[PDB]
Design a binder for this molecule. Structure first.
Ligand SMILES: *[C@@H]1O[C@H](CO)[C@@H](O)[C@H](O)[C@H]1NC(C)=O
Lengths: 47, 48, 48
């Protein structure tokens, strides 16, 4: 509907290779007045 | 006869202390009236 | 603490306003009861 909605969380872990067990909801972090069409996406990692 | 009676009134305490379910027919009436009021209040949120 | 016609942002009704112990997070602006009725409000001019 012309918004983009970002929810996020940050958590301490001690784990070597999987998505961790347990539960915690994501608070809304920012909303943006974007308007655009989207159909695919990409991530940026540091070299 | 008194020892059997005293023992049997003993078991009435044990039943009414141990389980939750023994009072089911009173809890069912309390639940139905609470459920009908929950419904009545929820219909205020309906748009019609 | 007095009966008042409240008008917060056009959300409107009659009630007594009392300081909350409700911890609204920075994103939350209204509170809702089990009844699906508004029961707490963040004031728009001070964040209480
Ligand atoms: C409302 O106005 C007063 C006086 O300028 C100011 O202290 C207060 O922070 C304002 N409210 C908001 C949401 O900034």
């Amino acid at each position: 509907d012309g918004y983009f909605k970002i929810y996020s969380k940050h958590t301490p872990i001690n784990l070597v290779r999987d998505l961790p067990q347990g539960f915690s909801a994501l608070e809304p972090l920012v909303d943006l007045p974007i308007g655009i069409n989207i159909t695919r996406f990409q991530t940026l990692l540091a070299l | 006869i008194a020892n059997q009676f005293n023992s049997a009134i003993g078991k009435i305490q044990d039943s009414l202390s141990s389980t939750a379910s023994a009072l089911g027919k009173l809890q069912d009436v309390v639940n139905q009236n609470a459920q009908a009021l929950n419904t009545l209040v929820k219909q205020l949120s309906s748009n019609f | 603490n007095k009966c008042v016609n409240f008008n917060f942002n056009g959300l409107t009704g009659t009630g007594v306003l009392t300081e909350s112990n409700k911890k609204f997070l920075p994103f939350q602006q209204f509170g809702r009861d089990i009844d699906d009725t508004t029961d707490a409000v963040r004031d728009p001019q001070t964040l209480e």
